[PDB]
Design a protein around this ligand. Structure first.
Ligand code: CL
Length: 316
């Protein structure tokens, strides 16, 4: 038989994972690609007629939106629950993380030493005036990080932080996460926020200009002396009306195997979720880091609050 995998998270190296799955289970993987938000809308519009078995995307904020659209069904699996850390899966078992990213401080190594960095909260301090670059508030990764800060601090204390943070922008938000790393390399900012895997992607590039940017920029995992670094997921779930629910479950279970964890995580320079699986060579030089134990569903729950806060403080 077969499963229909609707994914915004596919890389071509994942074909090896699909082929291994098929060898192990007999199930073919039919891949349907699209942007994550577009795939949610697609599955919603397909309704009860949808062939989708598995939905995969990035960011718990987006997985939460999927869940609230009613397109997922809950799955109880010993294998998923044992192998996936509780903080990286939906409390309601609607979706599950399969690789992990961190939203980190990217810094210009010539201008900034790691001893100068500490927490997310410290980024609102006046010493950083004119020195921070970050992308738009319309980006989900930012929404999820600010949601986490609202959960910790409450709206009033988080708004105080955000006002200071925005005050420190070197320029109006412009470009994607990679653009922020480039701006840090070029001296437009001294620090920026971006996901871990974008630095690794530059490190691995064959383009000399990308390598030169990676040579100039370090990454710092914040809040190590306190709650830990903000982590988020690439993840997925079984679709509400899946025509092959058993096969869908088998696929999710296969993704937590050590083989699949390596292939899937390394395909986008992300970290495994499963304990004991070795980390990608490109990530090792940055070291291990304490992860916050907050359940990542919170970042979806508070997504609208994050958007509102960012609007209120003038984060463009
Ligand atoms: Cl929590």
């Amino acid at each position: 038989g077969a499963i229909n995998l609707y994914s915004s998270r596919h890389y071509d190296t994942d074909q090896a994972l699909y082929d291994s799955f098929t060898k192990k289970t007999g199930l073919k993987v039919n891949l349907i690609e699209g942007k994550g938000d577009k795939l949610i809308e697609r599955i919603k519009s397909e309704g009860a007629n949808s062939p989708a078995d598995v939905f995969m995307t990035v960011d718990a904020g987006r997985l939460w939106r999927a869940q609230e659209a009613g397109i997922l069904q809950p799955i109880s699996s010993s294998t998923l629950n044992n192998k996936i850390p509780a903080n990286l899966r939906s409390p309601e078992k609607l979706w599950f993380g399969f690789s992990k990213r961190a939203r980190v401080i990217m810094y210009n190594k010539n201008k900034v030493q790691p001893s100068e960095l500490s927490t997310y909260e410290d980024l609102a301090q006046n010493k950083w005036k004119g020195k921070i670059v970050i992308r738009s508030s319309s980006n989900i990764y930012n929404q999820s990080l600010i949601a986490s800060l609202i959960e910790i601090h409450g709206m009033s204390d988080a708004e105080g932080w955000a006002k200071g943070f925005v005050r420190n922008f070197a320029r109006p938000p412009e470009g994607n996460d990679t653009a922020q790393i480039k701006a840090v390399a070029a001296g437009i900012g001294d620090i920026g926020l971006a996901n871990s895997y974008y630095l690794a992607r530059l490190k691995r590039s064959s383009k000399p200009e990308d390598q030169a940017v990676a040579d100039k920029v370090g990454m710092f995992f914040p809040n190590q002396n306190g709650r830990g670094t903000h982590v988020n997921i690439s993840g997925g779930g079984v679709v509400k009306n899946a025509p092959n629910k058993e096969g869908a479950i088998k696929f999710l279970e296969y993704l937590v195997s050590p083989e699949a964890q390596k292939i899937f995580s390394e395909g986008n320079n992300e970290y495994p979720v499963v304990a004991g699986v070795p980390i990608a060579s490109v990530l090792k030089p940055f070291g291990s880091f304490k992860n916050d134990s907050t359940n990542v569903s919170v970042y979806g729950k508070l997504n609208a609050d994050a958007i509102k806060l960012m609007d209120r403080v003038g984060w463009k």
